[PDB]
């Protein structure tokens, strides 16, 4: 009874505290107007704490401005469900004030509290409520738990089932509400999308659909890129092909991954999923805030070099160091702005992660967020194991995530592809 696809014939939120932080920068009113997802990203988010994450406005309060906006017509709000304990165990950018041990919390005083107010909103036949299920989380169990690199706080996560049992209960609490449409994170193509990540992404995915009374029936689709840069399309790059002898696949950048962009990615994840158990309608989301990498530096076609490296170096778009440098990475642009089902098995584009809102911090702030130092945020940061022992690649001087970040917002805009 839900509709295929909560994009399809909706207008799109407009999200007030994003839209002014957006207008008050210089040609900022260009994508002022934009549609971008609303983040709960503590229980203060829930009734509001004017807070620099959140500002003035309550879950209650965009909903009633999304019915609003609606103007009684079909209107879609997407809202991201992100506090869990231990949340982003591989990382420190974006811990948050619910420890490991605290599920019991995020049930009743963050769950509950959200359904009971989306409830509310059941009434309103033509506002669909886009639910994001906790970004950053699952993934982290497959590739961040044992062997060498990984985390103790994923290994107990892992252990303790509170990411599994809190993504299920999220799933049903806010599944079962009619008009609530739920996707999970998927990560993204430079991180679960080689042979060793993409199977057991899968039966991860497939196992929280099926935990805390949840079936795969509160499952409407998934969302992979969510606050990364992943290119959409590589236009040039074939992970399939060859330059002069030597596979694509053998260069620096691909490293044997299966895929080189978003799209194959999640359209062949999408079929995998399909095979697991998940229903045959799902569909796709791809976030692509961040992932436009145009401006003056855009490969305006393939190499003629006949090196692998400097071909794959100079034919791809996305121009990060490597592609496990997650946080605000310098020279990104605006990617293609929300879109209904532009690709099969794509529900839509979105710009969930808002543009000009950070990934971390660049040093030491002190805050009362949960949120610590990531050196992967450091510019000045040499990498580790998880990035091949290169630098960040992070924009310098950068405030704590969700914070407002003016010359990243700056950058982004700049770089917009396709050109505003
Ligand atoms: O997306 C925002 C989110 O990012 C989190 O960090 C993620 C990175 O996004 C992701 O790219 C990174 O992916 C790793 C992956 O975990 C490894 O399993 C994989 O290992 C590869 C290796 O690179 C190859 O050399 C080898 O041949 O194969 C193996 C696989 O068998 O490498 C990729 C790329 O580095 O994982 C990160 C998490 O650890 C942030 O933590 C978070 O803050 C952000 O919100
Ligand atoms: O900007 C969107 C979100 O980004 C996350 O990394 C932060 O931890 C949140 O506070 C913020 O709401
Ligand atoms: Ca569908």
């Not at 994001?132 to 060498?148: A, C, K, R, Y």
């Not at 399939?240 to 962009?261: E, H, P």
């Not at 098995?345 to 949960?370: F, H, L, Q, R, T």
């Amino acid at each position: 009874e839900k509709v295929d696809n909560p994009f399809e014939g909706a207008k799109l939120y407009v999200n007030p505290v994003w839209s002014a932080k957006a207008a008050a920068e210089p040609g900022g009113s260009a994508v002022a107007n934009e549609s971008t997802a609303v983040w709960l990203d503590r229980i203060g988010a829930i009734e509001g704490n004017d807070s620099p994450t959140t500002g003035s406005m309550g879950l209650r309060d965009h909903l009633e401005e999304a019915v609003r906006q609606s103007g009684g017509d079909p209107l879609t709000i997407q809202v991201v469900i992100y506090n869990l304990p231990g949340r982003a165990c591989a990382a420190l950018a974006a811990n948050g004030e619910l420890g490991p041990d605290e599920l019991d919390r995020y049930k009743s005083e963050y769950i509950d509290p959200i359904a009971d107010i989306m409830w509310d909103f059941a009434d309103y036949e033509n506002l669909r409520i886009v639910a994001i299920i906790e970004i950053d989380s699952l993934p982290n169990l497959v590739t961040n738990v044992g062997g060498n690199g990984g985390t103790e706080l994923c290994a107990y996560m892992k252990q303790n089932g509170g990411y599994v049992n809190g993504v299920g209960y999220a799933l049903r609490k806010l599944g079962e509400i009619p008009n609530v449409y739920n996707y999970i994170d998927a990560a993204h193509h430079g991180w679960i999308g080689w042979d060793s990540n993409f199977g057991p992404s899968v039966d991860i995915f497939y196992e929280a659909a099926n935990a805390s009374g949840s079936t795969v029936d509160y499952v409407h689709g998934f969302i992979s890129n969510t606050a990364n840069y992943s290119a959409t399309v590589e236009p040039y790059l074939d992970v399939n092909g060859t330059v002069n002898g030597q596979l694509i696949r053998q260069s620096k950048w691909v490293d044997w991954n299966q895929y080189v962009d978003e799209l194959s990615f999640v359209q062949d994840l999408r079929q995998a999923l399909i095979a697991k158990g998940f229903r045959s309608d799902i569909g796709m989301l791809i976030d692509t805030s961040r992932n436009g990498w145009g401006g003056p530096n855009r490969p305006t076609g393939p190499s003629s070099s006949t090196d692998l490296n400097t071909y794959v170096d100079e034919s791809r778009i996305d121009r990060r160091i490597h592609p496990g440098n997650w946080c605000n990475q310098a020279g990104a642009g605006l990617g293609e702005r929300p879109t209904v089902n532009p690709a099969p098995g794509v529900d839509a584009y979105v710009w969930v992660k808002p543009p000009g809102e950070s990934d971390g911090a660049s040093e030491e702030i002190p805050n009362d967020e949960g949120k610590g130092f990531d050196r992967m945020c450091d510019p000045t940061y040499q990498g580790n194991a998880r990035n091949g022992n290169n630098p960040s690649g992070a924009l310098p001087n950068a405030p704590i995530s969700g914070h407002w970040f003016s010359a990243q917002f700056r950058e982004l805009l700049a770089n917009a592809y396709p050109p505003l």
